[PDB]
Amino acid sequence: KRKALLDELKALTAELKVYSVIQSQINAALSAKQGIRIDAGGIDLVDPTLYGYAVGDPRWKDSPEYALLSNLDTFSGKLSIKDFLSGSPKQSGELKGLKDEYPFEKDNNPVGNFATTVSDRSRPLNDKVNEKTTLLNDT
Amino acid sequence: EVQLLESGGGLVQPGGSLRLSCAASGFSFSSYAMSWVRQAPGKGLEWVSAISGSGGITYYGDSAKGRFTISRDNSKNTLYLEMSSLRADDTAVYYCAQERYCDSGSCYERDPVFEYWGQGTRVTVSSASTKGPSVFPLAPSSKSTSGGTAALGCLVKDYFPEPVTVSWNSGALTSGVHTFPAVLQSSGLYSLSSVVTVPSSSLGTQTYICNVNHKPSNTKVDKRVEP
Amino acid sequence: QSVLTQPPSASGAPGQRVTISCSGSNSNIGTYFVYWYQQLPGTAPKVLIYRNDQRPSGVPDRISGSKSGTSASLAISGLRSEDEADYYCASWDASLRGYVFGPGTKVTVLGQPKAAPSVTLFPPSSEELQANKATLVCLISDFYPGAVTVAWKADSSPVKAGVETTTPSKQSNNKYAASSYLSLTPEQWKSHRSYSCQVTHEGSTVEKTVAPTECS
């Protein structure tokens, strides 16, 4: 019939889950007065720690999360946050101007501005979620 | 010297579009986020867009239906806004600013307040038809006559564009005449006045007369004074 | 919650000290350390202060920033011509509270004495009324500070029909002068047989009137 909009929402949900896990590191790092890494000096996103450990049966390999990550133009068998943010294809559009390591250097203190920048691409996802969920709630 | 510098500004036309832009110098601006702000005559400041253009929908405010938005390139150390489908009201002045001062979080939403500003430029909807003035003089009341001073003048209202020249007495009076750089008003139009000063004993005694030229039409305009 | 206000309204001779201050609340003020704005005539707005009290890479620490609980504040010493300005204690937003950027505050370096205004009033003649073009007027001259402010009344009723309120002029003595014009039908003269006006200036406020019968 017309299910494709739900599948777009499964994608938006997985997209937001990945951002939410990243923000869950960010808020802890800030609260611990630590910096954060987006590059090959940081973590890789194509890892079962996004939910748990090992292959918890094929459900994780089958997930819209794993599918999207393994689909990316920037995916290589591996993918950093920098490669994910500057990655494609995805519903949010791409983010430019990325660095490498964001230091908790006191004054001008920039780690919150990276969090805010990820929040900036999260706003369109809330907007798209709001409209698409509204249209779905008119289904 | 450390500063920003703008480009793009001046004049625009209805239903079309144009760009404004800002560039940094003396500092390695490099990656710092940027926000846009407007000014108008006789007021301080207001929001035009936050951070990036994300606080910058193609519909203004949180909603008002006007097509304005942005682009960003701190690698070029320079960033941009576009203006389209104009009202008259989009005629104004504009500025941009960078983040800097922030520590320990402290604000716990966005940032501790932003920190440095550009120089900015005028924008004007340049379609208006030329229109000559209405002009009105003064003839002093006897309340002025303690200290014997004929300070008298005239008003020039609701005309477009500038500029103007003023003189008196068949144009034969020229010294001591004051000058008033014109200002735009909520009719959509320019306004100014003038004042000049002589002994009260000469009032109504001589050829006393307001003598004006509106230079965009070159029209001469005049009004007399009587005892 | 609506908690800031912009009241201090100061002026002082060159080189003097001045204290400048604004209200607020502990949801807000505890989250910041000082930054405010300055604006010369004919310019775009500019930087003042940072790092609790430090002035720019271009001006000395003539200023101290400060705060206390439900209030925010500043003071200055050795004041100069570049401090001739409107000042804004703002926070770069409008948000929900009544003040979040706010009106600013006129402040003046008194390089002249605080001379009080001259006032004189202009009802035209009936010989000017016979053209229908005639207009009722007030003139003010020879003052500082520049913030003179005026409000006409049709007898007792504050006006907006027929109103014009010109820019002031700097006089050839370089004091200010200012004037207002009220263009009206003869029926608006013959019905409101006088007009009255508020005329406000520093320590100098008055209310004054015109009638066509004074100048007929």
TrEMBL record, chain A:
This is Type III secretion protein PcrV. The lineage of its organism: Bacteria, Pseudomonadati, Pseudomonadota, Gammaproteobacteria, Pseudomonadales. The gene is pcrV. The chain holds residues 127 to 265 of 294 of the full protein.
